[PDB]
Copies of this chain bind each other. A is one copy, B any other.
Amino acid sequence: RGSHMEVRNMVDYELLKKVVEAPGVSGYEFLGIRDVVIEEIKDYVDEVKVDKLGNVIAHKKGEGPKVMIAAHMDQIGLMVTHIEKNGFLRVAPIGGVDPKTLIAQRFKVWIDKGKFIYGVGASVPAPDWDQIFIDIGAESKEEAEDMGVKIGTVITWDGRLERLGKHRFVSIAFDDRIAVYTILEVAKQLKDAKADVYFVATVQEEVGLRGARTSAFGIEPDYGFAIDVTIAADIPGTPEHKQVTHLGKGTAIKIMDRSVICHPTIVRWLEELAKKHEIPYQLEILLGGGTDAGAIHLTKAGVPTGALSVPARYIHSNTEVVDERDVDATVELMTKALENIHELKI
């Protein structure tokens, strides 16, 4: 809170809870997260549309450059590939799932829209996919099918949002529901921006930035931004130079990841904005990873693109960890950016 002390709510807890707990595996975002996004953003924009692959495009009209801001609403999960004779389920990953995060875990097996049954992940006696299975308490293939399970059924971890200490949280899918949360807050806080703004909750980031590619083509923005998580490996046993970002040290301004080298004018501009407005920030370089920005910048004849990231520990698990001060800083910098973008010269 420490400038000339400011009072901030920092994160709207009930709203964050809504967004992290709606199911929305890649390709199947329509099952939960889509409608949560539409309901929570529609009042703050002039127009909401969902496009052909299911991207939610929320348009706030203004006189200025066309700006796209993308936050992916898909989460990683599992799909049922086979139902064994004794009712056990075999699975394939949707997105980059590590088998070791599935062992002795509870799951929500989505048998219909707004309907799940519990499952337990286990391995055949380190584990790879051939060894992983899900127990739903069925005794036979017939019983599992009776229960609503089919080849193609989608599954997420059973995770809920909880507080960790004074400023931190644990949850499923902070990647990238924390950014979906962020653009919802930007949408509320943005007023009279000299910018033609397109908030996009993208589909299928986790399987290759697919939703960002097609929505960016449709929108044809002058400038693009992604908001995603980035690695915070500020944990025991990590060399300082490999920590990438630190929790609570601010919003992360992306210099580059494996999918994008952010436009250096935009990188410099965002840093100077953060400095001017005393918003906590840190500079982000990812040796791997990839974000929607990787697709946006390559749209048509090219789009100058930047990115802000929320540092997150334990990415791609049921127990991702984020710091509310970094989330606050991200909302603020993005807001300031959109209010100042009519001045940006490239």
Residues of A within 8 A of B (CB): 26-28, 30, 51-53, 55, 79, 81-82, 84, 86, 88, 90, 92-94, 100-101, 103-106, 117-122, 124-126, 129-131, 133, 135-139, 143, 147, 150-152, 162-170, 204, 207, 210-211, 213-215, 217-218, 233-242, 248, 255-256, 261-264, 267, 283, 285, 287, 297-298, 300-304, 313-314, 317-319, 321, 346
| Residues of chain B contacted by A120 (CB below 8 angstroms) | 164, 170, 313-314, 319, 321
Report the bound CA distance from A240 to B84 in whole Å.
8
Report the bound CA distance from A161 to B211 in whole Å.
38
List 14 contacting pairs A-B, 8 Å CB cutoff, sorted by A. A30-B264, A51-B302, A81-B241, A84-B240, A90-B241, A104-B105, A104-B318, A105-B318, A120-B319, A122-B314, A124-B237, A133-B236, A204-B261, A218-B300
Report the bound CA distance from A168 to B147 in whole Å.
13
B214 touches A298 (CB 8 A): yes
A100 touches B84 (CB 8 A): no
Report the bound CA distance from A53 to B293 in whole Å.
13
Report the bound CA distance from A303 to B217 in whole Å.
12
The one of B100, B130, B139, B241 in contact with A239, judged by C-beta atoms closer than 8 angstroms, is: B130
- Closest chain B CB from A310 CB (angstroms): 15
B301 touches A122 (CB 8 A): no
A218 touches B302 (CB 8 A): yes
Known A-B contacts A242-B130, A304-B53; the reply to A118 vs B164 at CB < 8 A is yes
- Closest chain B CB from A191 CB (angstroms): 29
B121 touches A319 (CB 8 A): yes
- Closest chain B CB from A324 CB (angstroms): 10
The one of B51, B88, B239, B301 in contact with A214, judged by C-beta atoms closer than 8 angstroms, is: B301
B79 touches A285 (CB 8 A): yes
| Residues of chain B contacted by A298 (CB below 8 angstroms) | 210, 213-214
| Residues of chain B contacted by A319 (CB below 8 angstroms) | 104-106, 120-122
B248 touches A139 (CB 8 A): yes
In the complex, the count of this chain's copies comes to 4
A137 touches B117 (CB 8 A): no
Given contacts A27-B261, A30-B264, A84-B241, 13 further A-B pairs with CB under 8 A are: A52-B301, A84-B240, A88-B236, A104-B319, A106-B170, A106-B318, A118-B170, A120-B170, A122-B314, A125-B237, A133-B235, A213-B298, A217-B302
| Residues of chain B contacted by A92 (CB below 8 angstroms) | 256, 285, 287
B28 touches A264 (CB 8 A): yes
- Closest chain B CB from A216 CB (angstroms): 9
| Residues of chain B contacted by A303 (CB below 8 angstroms) | 52
- Which of A242, A298, A313, A346 has most chain B Cβ within 10 Å? A298
The one of B125, B150, B248, B314 in contact with A238, judged by C-beta atoms closer than 8 angstroms, is: B125
Closest to A124 in B: B237
- Which of A139, A165, A210, A346 has most chain B Cβ within 10 Å? A165
The one of B104, B241, B302, B321 in contact with A52, judged by C-beta atoms closer than 8 angstroms, is: B302
The one of B88, B100, B118, B237 in contact with A235, judged by C-beta atoms closer than 8 angstroms, is: B88
A151 touches B285 (CB 8 A): yes
Closest to A233 in B: B125
| Residues of chain B contacted by A117 (CB below 8 angstroms) | 164-165
